[PDB]
Amino acid sequence: STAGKVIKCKAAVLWEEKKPFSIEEVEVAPPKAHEVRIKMVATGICRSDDHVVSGTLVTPLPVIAGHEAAGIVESIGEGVTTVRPGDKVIPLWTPQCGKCRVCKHPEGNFCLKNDLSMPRGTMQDGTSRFTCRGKPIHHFLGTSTFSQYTVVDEISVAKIDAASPLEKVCLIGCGFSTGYGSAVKVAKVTQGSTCAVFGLGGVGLSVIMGCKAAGAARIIGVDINKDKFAKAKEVGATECVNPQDYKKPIQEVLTEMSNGGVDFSFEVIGRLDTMVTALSCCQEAYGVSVIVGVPPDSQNLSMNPMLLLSGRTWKGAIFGGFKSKDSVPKLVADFMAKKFALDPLITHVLPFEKINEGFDLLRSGESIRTILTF
Amino acid sequence: STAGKVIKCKAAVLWEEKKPFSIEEVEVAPPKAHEVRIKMVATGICRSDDHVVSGTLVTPLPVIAGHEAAGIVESIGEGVTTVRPGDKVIPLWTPQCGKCRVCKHPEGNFCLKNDLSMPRGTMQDGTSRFTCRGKPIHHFLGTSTFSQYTVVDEISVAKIDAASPLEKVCLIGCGFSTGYGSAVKVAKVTQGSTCAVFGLGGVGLSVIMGCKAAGAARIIGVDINKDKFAKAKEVGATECVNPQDYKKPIQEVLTEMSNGGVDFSFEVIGRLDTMVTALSCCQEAYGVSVIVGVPPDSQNLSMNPMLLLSGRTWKGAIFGGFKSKDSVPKLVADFMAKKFALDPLITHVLPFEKINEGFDLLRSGESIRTILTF
Ligand SMILES: NC(=O)C1=CN([C@@H]2O[C@H](COP(=O)(O)OP(=O)(O)OC[C@H]3O[C@@H](n4cnc5c(N)ncnc54)[C@H](O)[C@@H]3O)[C@@H](O)[C@H]2O)C=CC1
Ligand SMILES: NC(=O)C1=CN([C@@H]2O[C@H](COP(=O)(O)OP(=O)(O)OC[C@H]3O[C@@H](n4cnc5c(N)ncnc54)[C@H](O)[C@@H]3O)[C@@H](O)[C@H]2O)C=CC1
Ligand SMILES: O=CNC1CCCCC1
Ligand SMILES: O=CNC1CCCCC1
Ligand SMILES: [Zn+2]
Ligand SMILES: [Zn+2]
Ligand SMILES: [Zn+2]
Ligand SMILES: [Zn+2]
């Protein structure tokens, strides 16, 4: 009964930095040309959503955040052809326009139509579909999933298996895919190798899954919260180390353990020091280090370039290097085919109304992923 | 006549930093077990040898530098099996012991027996085979080619084509292979790509040859010495730019020229700033940047890791990524087969006695490579 009409629904609005989310009534406009309105069913709480709160990730406010989710299309705008009302879909915070230089590149995935590099907080047309208390509200990465209904550009949505469990596959919208791809696609982990994974949250655990799927023989988790070790080992870690427990730099500990350095290392936290530690801990002649974590805004790191001259490779990636629209449905099909697991990542399931409690669990280190159900 | 006997011959000894080399009479001991004494025929002047003089590269003094050379085996020590007296050889300043974890890796080449990371200035056994005026003199990178005769460990020498032109193939000992490999092996340049090469000396020009051999469609040379542009174009550069010509930083110029960044960039100079510039000038989502240049001893650079998070790859290599003993003979064979050219890199040929003049030519910007003949 909503097609072609404004919808009034509940959403979590962040009015300013460093404040809790405010559950409010918002008004969601119907979709314009090449836009899709989606009924959200489940959304995950990613550390990147917290970065918005903390100021680590600068984006226009007030905003409706959220970028890891899954739902059902409610209606479509003029000219849409990739989805229809009723389809199961996952919003793509990294779009895939299919026409830019990156999209046409065989490897690149950071589409030039993204709203991450210089955020505008809007739809591709430069406007907003949301109003709250008479005020237009900004969008987030073109997705804004912390709302019962959202509107997204066609290039930022993927159709998925009609049989998918939305409360699980929302993870494929961000956390899982990012981590998993960082291992199998960006780093290209090899059979029998030794890997080090710094950070054992939702993304890091997905990195471990990817290292295991690639055939790694040894996987070392690194985290200051030891309650994360058990889960890290269940998904593939052979060993875990806690930097707080040691008298010397963890890079020396990891280098000794691995008889001279690891094959592949991953920074999945978001700290300058751990980015350099991760690079240093890989074998100097052939090691590969991938940065996944997001540091805070603007601050530069200092490092010795001879760490690279010796032969190391250092790189980073968005969304695990996956071309979004092409990949998401394939990942869901692999999940349905039982090629990987998502349950281990989920520690909590809460109603959407408890979003702030979900963020509390993240900050306190008591959760991996909290899935919010609408 | 000389086997098993001390040889008295001329060599260039560097007694102190920032001094001219001193032509001296030195005593060269016969080879000990698993060592090989070689009569040098030709040696090139590489910027790395100048780094020893300038203090850019710290290594024990006094020393006999030189590492880009070709010669003929004069005698061998007990147990040697890979070369015989009379064989044409090229000394290897990166060894290949064949036994360490790097030598056994399919890609890595920075053998753990190198004398580059933590230089001792000696043979593998920790002693020296050179005496001058009764004082022991240090070796350099296990090669010490600035002497009529040198002694090298077996893992630091490769036999080559008996008909090879030693005054040309010496370049394969360093400059050419480093640049060529950095493009074809380390960067893995792709057909139709756009490359940027920072530094148009012997190594940078070799990088251009590798980019051309890889099929690059566009190659932009960057040097503050415009006198190098004609040769750069001769070997494959489509364009050349001089940063001194511009008010804008060179990365902005390069990014604009390449419609958003190059595919592959190479720093072949040895400056911290240029390393970051080169990285920044490659495409943000899929660009690759390789560091080849050597900066002053132990100095760190400052950079924003968001440069990598977007998807850039940053790496470095020693000797073009080539496993030394395995590759050098193959490279010589390729040269003999006309698969690449070495002449365009040689601007001057001088007697060894004029070593200082050759270093002067390098520092003034008049030469690409000077070859010293004994
Ligand atoms: N590159 C991409 O495309 C994306 C990047 N990210 C970023 O990846 C990072 C991780 O994301 P989540 O897993 O959601 O975060 P999380 O907060 O769930 O996990 C972070 C882990 O790092 C641990 N940690 C914190 N400080 C540490 C330290 N000094 N030393 C060792 N361990 C430490 C924490 O105890 C925690 O377990 C975040 O920065 C996020 O913004 C998130 C997904 C996509
Ligand atoms: N990674 C490895 O295995 C090896 C590293 N190297 C290093 O490669 C570098 C190049 O070696 P060569 O070709 O022999 O040196 P070179 O002195 O012949 O050439 C260097 C070029 O850089 C230019 N240049 C200087 N400052 C510049 C600036 N701000 N901007 C743009 N261009 C500038 C110079 O005019 C010159 O043409 C040296 O640092 C050397 O030590 C040398 C070979 C092996
Ligand atoms: O978490 C999802 N997206 C992230 C990607 C890295 C920059 C912060 C936003
Ligand atoms: O130039 C020859 N060898 C180089 C290798 C890189 C550090 C300086 C010495
Ligand atoms: Zn996320
Ligand atoms: Zn695109
Ligand atoms: Zn050299
Ligand atoms: Zn070795």
Swiss-Prot record, chains A, B:
GO terms, molecular function: all-trans-retinol dehydrogenase (NAD+) activity; zinc ion binding
GO cellular component term, pick one: cytosol
UniProt xrefs under CDD domains: alcohol_DH_class_I_II_IV (cd08299)
Natural source organism: Equus caballus (Horse)
Record's keyword terms, sorted: Acetylation, Cytoplasm, Metal-binding, NAD, Oxidoreductase, Zinc
Cofactor(s) required, per the database record: Zn(2+)
Catalytic activity reported: a primary alcohol + NAD(+) = an aldehyde + NADH + H(+); a secondary alcohol + NAD(+) = a ketone + NADH + H(+)
Family from the record: Belongs to the zinc-containing alcohol dehydrogenase family. Class-I subfamily.
Pfam family for this entry, one: ADH_zinc_N
Catalytic activity, EC: 1.1.1.1
Protein name: Alcohol dehydrogenase E chain
Enzymatic class: oxidoreductase
